[PDB]
Design a protein around this ligand. Structure first.
Ligand SMILES: CCC1=C(C)/C(=C/C2=NC(=C\c3[nH]c(/C=C4\NC(=O)[C@H](C)[C@H]4CC)c(C)c3CCC(=O)O)/C(CCC(=O)O)=C2C)NC1=O
Ligand SMILES: CCC1=C(C)/C(=C/C2=NC(=C\c3[nH]c(/C=C4\NC(=O)[C@H](C)[C@H]4CC)c(C)c3CCC(=O)O)/C(CCC(=O)O)=C2C)NC1=O
Ligand SMILES: CCC1=C(C)/C(=C/C2=NC(=C\c3[nH]c(/C=C4\NC(=O)[C@H](C)[C@H]4CC)c(C)c3CCC(=O)O)/C(CCC(=O)O)=C2C)NC1=O
Ligand SMILES: CCC1=C(C)/C(=C/C2=NC(=C\c3[nH]c(/C=C4\NC(=O)[C@H](C)[C@H]4CC)c(C)c3CCC(=O)O)/C(CCC(=O)O)=C2C)NC1=O
Ligand SMILES: CCC1=C(C)/C(=C/C2=NC(=C\c3[nH]c(/C=C4\NC(=O)[C@H](C)[C@H]4CC)c(C)c3CCC(=O)O)/C(CCC(=O)O)=C2C)NC1=O
Ligand SMILES: CCC1=C(C)/C(=C/C2=NC(=C\c3[nH]c(/C=C4\NC(=O)[C@H](C)[C@H]4CC)c(C)c3CCC(=O)O)/C(CCC(=O)O)=C2C)NC1=O
Ligand SMILES: CCC1=C(C)/C(=C/C2=NC(=C\c3[nH]c(/C=C4\NC(=O)[C@H](C)[C@H]4CC)c(C)c3CCC(=O)O)/C(CCC(=O)O)=C2C)NC1=O
Ligand SMILES: CCC1=C(C)/C(=C/C2=NC(=C\c3[nH]c(/C=C4\NC(=O)[C@H](C)[C@H]4CC)c(C)c3CCC(=O)O)/C(CCC(=O)O)=C2C)NC1=O
Ligand SMILES: CCC1=C(C)/C(=C/C2=NC(=C\c3[nH]c(/C=C4\NC(=O)[C@H](C)[C@H]4CC)c(C)c3CCC(=O)O)/C(CCC(=O)O)=C2C)NC1=O
Ligand SMILES: CCC1=C(C)/C(=C/C2=NC(=C\c3[nH]c(/C=C4\NC(=O)[C@H](C)[C@H]4CC)c(C)c3CCC(=O)O)/C(CCC(=O)O)=C2C)NC1=O
Ligand SMILES: CCC1=C(C)/C(=C/C2=NC(=C\c3[nH]c(/C=C4\NC(=O)[C@H](C)[C@H]4CC)c(C)c3CCC(=O)O)/C(CCC(=O)O)=C2C)NC1=O
Lengths: 69, 246, 162, 172, 172, 162, 172, 172, 162
């Protein structure tokens, strides 16, 4: 994170529409429920792992913004 | 004609009579109505979840902070000369979740000072599990994976392996403060997970303190080590015998 | 077990702090309502036999087909277990009257309720009917405040089953 | 964990040898009776609630002591624990059945259980008797001849009895 | 973690029985005396900083060796730890005073305390001495007749004293 | 700024559950206390100005060096700010009395209080002595439940100050 | 997350003065009717699952396109979630009734439910109809004069009707 | 005939195993506390005329239609047989109390009593009522503190009550 | 089974009377005599397999011909089931210790012993001297009070075999 690639974090809005709702129904509701639509901040280094994680869960993104540059 | 009509007064009467010997006091259960007292985890289990709904107000933000600094660091004291105030401010408006805040506290120099520098890597892996997850490690595969991951990619990636794991997503998620959960049967564990969380958690008053004459030695790597890697003992025996008798 | 006192202490220690004014407000409210609640527990304790018998009768009357052979409620043993379960439920209602909280209920009966009633094939509706009878008799047995709080614990148990 | 194929590979490697023709013979046998093993495992999977409930009824028949006030399985929060322990041990027995070795059963289930129950205060003889009753109530569902081809399978019943016995002896 | 009510409930359920009318009378008397109990808890809570500071001053007067080099309470970190420990102990005695039973102490306060001190090397007799000083300082504030009506609370004073003795005995 | 009622709502929604007998009982006690609390708050609102002046004179007679130049107190605007701050504290104490909870007081003063005192070099003992003066004088203005609850709130404010 | 008292204090701070006489009089009047409010809250919390079941039965009765294949609540899980929202919104209405301020419902969920339901494809006018059904059933249960002291509670009836009506109009 | 020791022994033998440690603990506790049992059995033996007479008085003062002509306790032979049956049932309850096991009762008094009472026309409901009245009169006598050392015997009270209830439920 | 308690009850039963002083006297003697007996049973049970192995090898050492081919002790089944028989005798001696009476011995072993020994040609002497070995081994296995009880029951078994 110290180098240049470390900075330029990104802001991502996340929607948990029925595609993830069905998966959460089947797997169960074990954490408190939350509204489907929300926004999340992510650094450049962690971008790929968290994005793989969120799509693998089933939620779908609307758009992604670049915080720096 | 035992009871032709819809009334059952004889059947209810005889049921209530025979139920007297079905509810007799047993042999003894005084030390048994609470087996958690033997596990010494009564306080840990009776500690409820500490969530932070984003529109939360000023009060219980300090409550969530107390829970976090009690969990992540253990019961070790953390002087507010050490509280990252910028991280708490960022968490206040939700610029970061409780998961991101716990990521930061894991990556502060106080957490490292208490857990990394004074201990071997084994104790560090056990403590990461017990604090950022709530459970003892189940098998040597976890220890090997985390040790090699740290060695190859840094403390940063080693911690990110905990914080953004799917176990953290499922059990706690973005906005629930971690808690000790190995005392209950968590799906897909060994019986060594519960034993390990009992071994690491010696008391509610106690803590995992660096400033100790033990040197904060590893409580569990001996416990965790044998089961996976002693099935080959039966042959290493006679190999050692031929080495000795030579 | 949770009570007013224990919930107060738990919230206070979850913030490492002392008992503030609100904690003492709640605690004294409990100490003030612990007179009617102990009255209700005394009444429901004088009358364990009447309530257990009546509840077993009401269960059988609303569920006659279990008494017949080839199913669950046949035998001296299984009806004795019926009366014993109703004694358990009434006993824990009296406990939760004394402890002025749903601690004993949620700890003993309501925890692990669906799983045990599922693996032994017992039915929620039997106990719901027994508890509706106990609620009825409590209405005629307790008057005023004690009646109200006893009904809060009884219908807490009912909603736990339902 | 080690099923029988990986087990045989292990004893082959630790002595620095390939797999002898006889070893391949036994293990190909295991492969061909694999379908019978699958049938037995399915019998254990599908009749699981019945086996557990029958063992529970019998176990609390001999020892009513557990379900009286002050007994271990009393408070109705420990009854669910009893039933879940039964489910876990049955599940691990079926796992060891499909695999072919008690490696799954002795690793993920049994190594730290007797002292877990000692810590909780739970009697271990009762858990052993529960597993024995489960073995009984599970052979009869295992021997069921309905809706499946007919053949000799005494090896599988012997093996499943050994697994139940090993779990019981571990906990007891 | 059991108040007096839940304690009577538990030893009732061991007998598999309803609460006797004697136990009902006892718990009714407790609920009636709860006003005195609440006033004692409030007197301890408001005067927590005064009591902790006073006990710290007396402890470091009668015992100096802690604060010179090599002593237990030397750096600002260890003085902060000492004050934090004493505050926690007073807090838990207030908790026990409200609950009416010493369950909270053995459950949380003293669950692993003596082991912690024997680990870190803290002189346990010094901690017991600090608890005794808090006892002495706290009885003064509890007996404060100002701002409350007059009544016999000697039972509550004895109960708080016993809680402090229990903490001291467990630590030492 | 949550009273007993709103903290009940928050803790009940925390578990995703309705409100059972314990927290309804606590809210009942709080409602019944809303009468003496309102009376005490009315009594203090009757006596706001006399208390602001008595507090500034009390803190000055206790702290004489503050009057002398070279210290914070010297300057007409400075004693004006003193009186304004004591008015703030009294207003928040009355607010907490009305709300029967430390919500208003805690969030409106105690939140980030120590940092404010350090960054503006205000010694807390000034406000502590002012609040002790208010305590002593309300010892006679109020009686019974109103007196004890108002004194408890003042003690909470002092403890948060020291 | 604020009630009537906290709103009054909020306006007091925005004007900066103390609490006036008329405001304190309305607050005292509200506190006088506290037990009436508690009884309505108890009715709602006790009869909650009954109200949910009745509302679900009715709504699935007059309108059937949900239950048909391709309907919104067709699959077993989706209508399970519909009953989940049933209970959630009814619980929040009980909350807003106890507090006295609907804003705890409003800011928490009413803003976001519009967008989330438009995303899911759930038609929200049906949700409003459901809320009206719930208000009907809850008003029926609150009408119950049985087993409680009698008095004029028309204010509570109107206020709960307003809660449900505004929640419906917001979701619709 | 049996007692607690022989019952445990018979269970162990039918199973084929030595007596386990826990069962030995139970029998040791029984033998240790059997002195209270001897006091209870003596309380039944020594006051038995008082129990029988009080139970008879109450039974015939509440159920008049027994002592009426044509009632089934009318002449002295039937009244004497009534009192003799009462004494015999109380005798076998004291026996089973000393033994700690209700086998002697179920084998000598209760294995053919409902049939005999039906074949004689005696209302078994009234016989069970007589047994319960004897239970009440006896409990007045087992709780007597005169001539014995103070102590707790709730277990023996429960045990004797269950023996009387066994007699009642096996006659009624 | 014939014990002290059961014999008392049967004697007071056949005579149609309550339990008078002598009967409770004997019962008390049994109850306090229990503890040495229970300890003896615990010791014999703990040291069961060693005692059985010792008694088996004593049978073979004293009766050397029995293991020679062509007769009783030859072959593995007969040794394993010798161990079984000695285990039975030991188990019933401990049963009789716990019950503090010769009930279990006179029921499960002594009743019907001569007929089944005659019909299988089992020499009683094998069992008599195996019991003699156990009788000796309890001398260094038990000591004190319970030794007399254990010796007494080993002794009754030996007398019944002879
Ligand atoms: C970060 C500080 C630290 C280190 C590096 C450390 C070493 C270490 N070596 C280990 C295993 C091992 N260690 C070795 C190396 C030895 N074995 C052979 O005899 C070699 C000749 C000899 C090397 C000189 C081997 C081969 C293993 C693997 C054993 C196994 O997988 O079962 C393990 C347990 C699991 C693992 O990491 O594989 C640790 C923790 N301990 C620490 O606290
Ligand atoms: C801590 C509180 C507690 C509760 C609530 C409780 C419920 C309960 N009742 C039971 C027995 C039973 N209960 C019933 C059903 C009853 N009998 C019939 O007469 C009626 C129709 C019906 C009551 C209305 C039956 C048939 C059994 C025994 C057989 C079985 O169902 O497995 C059992 C199983 C115990 C056993 O196997 O013997 C439980 C767990 N147990 C507890 O310890
Ligand atoms: C993956 C392998 C695995 C197993 C098998 C396992 C068993 C296990 N059973 C437990 C509880 C329990 N288990 C039982 C069951 C016993 N009580 C009666 O005697 C029955 C006869 C008998 C059941 C056969 C009971 C009553 C408890 C509750 C103990 C307590 O809460 O005090 C616990 C403590 C955690 C909890 O409270 O749920 C464990 C760890 N854990 C594991 O990780
Ligand atoms: C999806 C999982 C799966 C299952 C369950 C399965 C069952 C299965 N069992 C088969 C034969 C068989 N099935 C059995 C099992 C039964 N016979 C014994 O008497 C017992 C009652 C019992 C076993 C304990 C046996 C013995 C055979 C004969 C196989 C052989 O000749 O070796 C066959 C081959 C011919 C056929 O019936 O279609 C199949 C496919 N196959 C699968 O892919
Ligand atoms: C890292 C080493 C270390 C430090 C720095 C430290 C600070 C310290 N100073 C103390 C006493 C004190 N120090 C002072 C200093 C004041 N006296 C006058 O007023 C001056 C204006 C001013 C001196 C510049 C005073 C008044 C006390 C007494 C406090 C009391 O007893 O209430 C005490 C309490 C008793 C003691 O330890 O002696 C501590 C803990 N403690 C440590 O272990
Ligand atoms: C359940 C609530 C709870 C308790 C009870 C508790 C006691 C406690 N005190 C500690 C440190 C300490 N506590 C003291 C207190 C001593 N100083 C003087 O000797 C006094 C006589 C005495 C105070 C009465 C000191 C000096 C330390 C630091 C010792 C060291 O780290 O070497 C620690 C180690 C944590 C750390 O690393 O800082 C614990 C766990 N902690 C808790 O979370
Ligand atoms: C803000 C929360 C709150 C609390 C905690 C509270 C306590 C409280 N103290 C009371 C008076 C009292 N207070 C005390 C206690 C005192 N007796 C003295 O000896 C001691 C110095 C001291 C206790 C150690 C006693 C004895 C009474 C009389 C009430 C009675 O006898 O029952 C009363 C009843 C009013 C009266 O009878 O005058 C209450 C409710 N009230 C509240 O609104
Ligand atoms: C603040 C508390 C909260 C609320 C109120 C809430 C509403 C809500 N209900 C949902 C599911 C649902 N909700 C409904 C309800 C519809 N079915 C029909 O009966 C009606 C038209 C209507 C109800 C009257 C259905 C069918 C689903 C399933 C949609 C799907 O999984 O695709 C979802 C999708 C994700 C999830 O379930 O977590 C949300 C966000 N979510 C929350 O976290
Ligand atoms: C823990 C929960 C709780 C309950 C259950 C409760 C019942 C309760 N209802 C009361 C009076 C009352 N209760 C009600 C409410 C009922 N009357 C009618 O209007 C409606 C059918 C219904 C409300 C919609 C009324 C109107 C009064 C009379 C008090 C007044 O005039 O304001 C009182 C005051 C003492 C009494 O009159 O007996 C209590 C304690 N209090 C509680 O704190
Ligand atoms: C010849 C026939 C015979 C009799 C009559 C007899 C009575 C008897 N009762 C005793 C004690 C006792 N007796 C009782 C029974 C009484 N206390 C309870 O509260 C009730 C009031 C009542 C029984 C329901 C108790 C509880 C003890 C003390 C328990 C113990 O010995 O450990 C003792 C031992 C002395 C002692 O430890 O105090 C004897 C010998 N023993 C005999 O061998
Ligand atoms: C209730 C307790 C009980 C006893 C005591 C008992 C004795 C007993 N021993 C038997 C056989 C036997 N028992 C022995 C004993 C010999 N073995 C060695 O050689 C020794 C020299 C010696 C033992 C010290 C032998 C050789 C037989 C087989 C003889 C035959 O089959 O005819 C048999 C015939 C049934 C059978 O075992 O097949 C009985 C009934 N059985 C019981 O159920």
């Amino acid at each position: 994170a110290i180098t240049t690639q470390g900075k330029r974090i990104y802001k991502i809005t996340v929607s948990e529409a029925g595609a993830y709702a069905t998966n959460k129904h089947r797997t169960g509701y074990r954490a408190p429920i939350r509204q489907s639509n929300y926004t999340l901040t992510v650094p450049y280094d962690r971008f790929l792992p968290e994005m793989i994680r969120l799509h693998q869960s089933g939620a779908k993104i609307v758009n992604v913004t670049s915080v720096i540059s | 004609p035992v009871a032709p009509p819809l009334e059952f007064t004889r059947e209810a009467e005889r049921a209530a009579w025979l139920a007297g010997a079905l509810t007799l006091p047993s042999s003894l259960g005084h030390t048994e109505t609470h087996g958690q007292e033997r596990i010494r985890a009564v306080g840990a289990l009776e500690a409820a979840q500490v969530t932070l709904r984003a529109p939360f107000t000023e009060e219980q933000f300090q409550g969530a902070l107390y829970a976090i600094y009690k969990q992540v660091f253990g019961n070790t004291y953390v002087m507010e000369s050490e509280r990252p105030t910028t991280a708490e401010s960022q968490l206040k408006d939700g610029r970061i979740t409780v998961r991101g805040f716990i990521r930061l506290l894991a990556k502060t120099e106080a957490y490292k000072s208490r857990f990394l520098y004074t201990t071997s890597q084994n104790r560090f892996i056990e403590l990461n599990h017990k604090l950022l997850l709530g459970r003892a490690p189940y098998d040597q595969a976890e220890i090997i994976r985390h040790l090699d991951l740290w060695n190859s990619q840094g403390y940063d990636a080693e911690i990110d392996s905990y914080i953004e794991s799917e176990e953290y997503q499922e059990f706690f998620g973005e906005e629930v403060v971690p808690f000790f959960r190995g005392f209950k049967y968590q799906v897909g564990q060994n019986p060594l997970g519960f034993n390990g969380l009992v071994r690491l958690y010696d008391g509610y008053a106690g803590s995992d303190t660096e400033r100790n004459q033990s040197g904060q030695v590893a409580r569990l790597t001996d416990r965790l080590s044998r089961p996976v890697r002693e099935q080959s003992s039966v042959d290493r025996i006679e190999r050692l015998l031929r080495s000795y008798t030579s | 077990s949770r009570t007013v006192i224990t919930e107060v202490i738990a919230t206070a220690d979850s913030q490492g702090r002392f008992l503030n004014s609100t904690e003492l407000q709640a605690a004294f409210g409990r100490f003030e309502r612990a007179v009617p609640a102990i009255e209700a527990a005394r009444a429901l304790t004088k009358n364990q036999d009447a309530l257990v018998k009546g509840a077993v009768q009401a269960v059988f009357k609303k569920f006659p087909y279990v008494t017949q052979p080839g199913e669950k409620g046949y035998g001296d043993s299984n009806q004795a277990k019926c009366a014993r379960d109703i004694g358990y439920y009434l006993r824990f209602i009296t406990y939760s009257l004394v402890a002025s909280g749903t601690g004993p209920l949620d700890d003993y009966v309501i925890a692990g309720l669906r799983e045990v009633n599922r693996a032994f094939n017992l039915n929620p509706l039997w106990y719901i009917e027994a508890l509706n009878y106990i609620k009825g008799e409590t209405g005629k047995l307790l008057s005023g405040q004690s009646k109200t709080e006893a009904l809060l614990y009884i219908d807490h148990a009912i909603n736990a089953l339902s | 964990m080690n099923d029988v194929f990986t087990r045989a590979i292990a004893q082959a490697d630790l002595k620095g040898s390939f797999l002898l023709e006889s070893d391949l013979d036994k293990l190909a046998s295991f492969a061909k009776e694999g379908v019978k093993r699958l049938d037995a495992v399915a019998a254990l999977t599908n009749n699981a609630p019945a086996i557990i409930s029958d063992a529970a009824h019998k176990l609390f028949a001999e020892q009513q002591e557990l379900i009286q006030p002050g007994g271990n399985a009393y408070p109705h929060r420990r009854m669910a624990a009893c039933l879940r322990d039964m489910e876990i041990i049955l599940r691990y027995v079926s796992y060891a059945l499909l695999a072919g070795d008690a490696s799954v059963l002795d690793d993920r289930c049994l190594n730290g259980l007797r002292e877990t129950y000692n810590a909780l205060g739970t009697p271990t003889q009762s858990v052993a008797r529960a597993v024995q009753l489960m073995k009984d109530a599970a052979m009869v569902h295992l021997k069921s001849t309905a809706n499946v081809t007919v053949g000799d399978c005494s090896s599988l019943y012997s093996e499943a009895a050994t697994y139940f016995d090993k779990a019981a002896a571990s906990i007891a």
